[PDB]
Amino acid sequence: FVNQHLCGSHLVEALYLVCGERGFFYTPKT
Amino acid sequence: GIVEQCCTSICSLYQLENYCN
Numbered sequence: 001f002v003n004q005h006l007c008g009s010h011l012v013e014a015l016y017l018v019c020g021e022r023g024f025f026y027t028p029k030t
Numbered sequence: 031g032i033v034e035q036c037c038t039s040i041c042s043l044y045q046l047e048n049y050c051n
Contacts, residue, residue, distance in 0.1 A: 002043050002046060003040060003042065005037055005039070005041065007036075011032065011037060011041070018050065019047070019049070019051070023050070024049050024050050026049070028032065029031075030032075
C-alpha cells in the first residue's frame with residue numbers, strides 16, 4: 001500500500017484512501 | 031515535493047499525510 005514507490009494514478013489513489021474526507025492536493029511539479 | 035518523496039523514493043504515511051488538507 002503506502003510503503004513503496006507510488007507514481008501517477010497509484011500515488012493519487014493512495015492519497016485518496018489515506019486522506020479520506022479531508023481531501024488532498026496533488027502537485028507533481030514543485 | 032510529493033513525487034520526490036513518494037515516487038522517486040519510497041513513500042511513507044507520514045509523508046502522504048503532509049498532502050492531506
